[PDB]
RNA sequence: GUGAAGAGGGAAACAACCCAGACCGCCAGCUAAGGUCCCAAAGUCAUGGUUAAGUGGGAAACGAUGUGGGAAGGCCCAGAC
RNA sequence: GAUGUCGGCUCAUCACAUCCUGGGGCUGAAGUAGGUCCCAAGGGUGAUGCUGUUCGCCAUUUAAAGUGGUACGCGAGCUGG
RNA sequence: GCUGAAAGCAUCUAAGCACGAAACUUGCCCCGAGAUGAGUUCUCCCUGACCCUUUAAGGGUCCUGAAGGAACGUUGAAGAC
């Protein structure tokens, strides 16, 4: 609704094409391409992108919306990308990055190996945090979620990987 | 995860979303009140 | 007089091909079953196997509405104890697709030899070539 | 990986320099020879057909002695196809040798199991005998009930009751490879494998990894 | 009222429910209750709307931003949520 | 003008309202171990003393010694307390 | 869970994308083309006359008797037969 009336600007030096559905963007940091449901028509307005609901679709608004935050994140994306940061915090838990290949140590019995996909690539900054860099912000989402997973920050110490923002609110046993 | 016939808000913080068909109660201030219809 | 009767000797079957692609399954089923009986014509007897062969193509890429395409289950039971055996649409599709077709035509059909000599007259395809061509089957749009 | 056939010479054990005996089967596996080969084009799948032994030129009938007349081989007992894995071919009359489980260590081995006849309940399925006194009249081995009352009013398939047991096809799996000797014909694995003495046995790298 | 002492058609099958009271024959027609995609006779009929669960085709107290429609009411372009 | 009745033996078979094993949510969940709820029926699920006993109480086990339907499953299969 | 509107916020879901159990379909073992929807592959064998009539069919005579099979016998770690 007031998300798809708001048109989508495209900056200098990203490239937009529209077939039919399939929507591409070209921009410094690659390639994102996406279709479209069939109930959202987009027009390349001077500039701009312009998002409506197709005639005889119901909820064609909502699916408006969807895409037009999508395409939004999209042409984000394509400029300078998105990263998240995660923070490994328990005595020993330790993360290193190797070619597109990620170490963990998070006190198992073996070692944990995580393979980054295609357009993500990951940076250790320091012994004990990850920094990912993408164009695509759900893959890169992703791929922060299930390295969270290996070892979810546990309630009574904070111990596991976590969002470097996120809070934890951790609690305390029992007296006695 | 409460599973019961009457789901209902019960903090402020607690939000009510149909999920695949069955309601659920979600509460981001504590887990104490995540509730589902069954 | 007595009213006319089909010889099963001198009765004209005639060849068609129907492209099953996008085609409701019930939709496409009913119109088998009735040209497979003979319903279609006017010397049509109850007793006699009157009906066309028809042969289906693209039996994979039948549709349904609705959720059924992962809700509709085909539920069969092989004589044991544990016997209850399912699949849903998708996975019949998966398995052997040319079943769902023959399944719902086979439901639509009248029981006994008869029907069954109807049936045999069914040629399901899952791909879209068939190997009927010294048949001469002309194309029938359901 | 392809197999070979063999015949159950018989049992024997090997001892261990350390002090210990391993009861070994002997599988006398000769020359394997391909008499056919099938392909996808052809045939649907890939397999090689081969045979073993040697039998009297005087019955072999004329279809079997034109068959392996196509391949240029010498007649053999019998006949039996192996399925082709997607890396090897083999070529027809080529000779297949039991160095094939040269580094093998783990066989399977399919026979068929020596013929215990019509055997009754407790034989064949473990069945439970009944009291041998203390009034039980004329049922000591019998089967006891074979269902229920008029609610199913019919015995379930598949129940289990006496009949034939044995002479039926039987795979071990995993058996270890003792050793594996070319100029004698020989292979020698760990424990016992389906059948009499002198029949035969169709041994196969080990599926179960 | 019906069965008993009443057959026929419908209700899948179903004395006692619904329609309807069999003198006999016809390879004639119109209807009742029920129905008209195929089994299986007859609308894949027409116009307008509703529902998305296979609800239709089993079941309550109670629970819920499921949607369809009304009658009213505040908060507000002095800027509302 | 006959449908054999309690318990044991032999042989079972299904349901799931799950005893164990499998997967999870919450915990007044530090760990170990628990409590409670949700998913799950693939396989498994004691041999003794007393009593006709089912049950039960005991003695020792076990990962566990499930709850029910099957004419309180089963006497043209046995027993006959 | 990720991205994400409806509902400028939130939201695992409405579009889209991930994980997730001894259950399910496979994978392992056996039976299995009477799968009358009776499948495929390889190999082998048989290429003589004549008559009749209710003929589009068939019947019959003479010559021929293959590949194989069965029967019989000696039997079997196969077997009630």
Known sequence: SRVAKAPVVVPAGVDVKINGQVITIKGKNGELTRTLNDAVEVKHADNTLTFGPRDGYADGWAQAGTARALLNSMVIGVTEGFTKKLQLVGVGYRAAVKGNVINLSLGFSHPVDHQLPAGITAECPTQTEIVLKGADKQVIGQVAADLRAYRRPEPYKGKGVRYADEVVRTKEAKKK | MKVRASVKKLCRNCKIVKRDGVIRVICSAEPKHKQRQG | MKTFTAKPETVKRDWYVVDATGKTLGRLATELARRLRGKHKAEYTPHVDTGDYIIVLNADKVAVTGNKRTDKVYYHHTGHIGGIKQATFEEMIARRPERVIEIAVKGMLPKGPLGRAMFRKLKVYAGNEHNHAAQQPQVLDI | ?209
């Open chain 4, 1 to 209: 990986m392809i197999g070979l056939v063999g015949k159950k010479v018989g049992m024997t054990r090997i001892f261990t320099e350390d002090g210990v005996s391993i009861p070994v089967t002997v599988i006398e596996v000769e020359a394997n020879r391909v008499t056919q080969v099938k392909d996808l084009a052809n045939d649907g799948y890939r397999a090689i057909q081969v045979t073993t032994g040697a039998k009297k030129a005087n019955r072999v009938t004329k279809p079997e002695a034109g068959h392996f007349a196509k391949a240029g081989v010498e007649a053999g007992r019998g006949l039996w196809e192996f399925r082709l894995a997607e890396g090897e071919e083999f070529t027809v009359g080529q000779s297949i040798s039991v160095e094939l489980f040269a580094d093998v260590k783990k066989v399977d081995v399919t026979g068929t199991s020596k013929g215990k006849g019509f055997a009754g309940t407790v034989k064949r399925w473990n069945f439970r005998t009944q009291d041998a006194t203390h009034g039980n009249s004329l049922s000591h081995r019998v089967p006891g009930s074979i269902g229920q009352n008029q609610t199913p009013g019919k015995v379930f398939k598949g129940k289990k009751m006496a009949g034939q047991m044995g002479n039926e096809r039987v795979t071990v799996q995993s058996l270890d490879v003792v050793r594996v000797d070319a100029e004698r014909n020989l292979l020698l694995v760990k424990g016992a494998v389906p059948g009499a003495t002198g029949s035969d046995l169709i041994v196969k790298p080990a599926v179960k990894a």
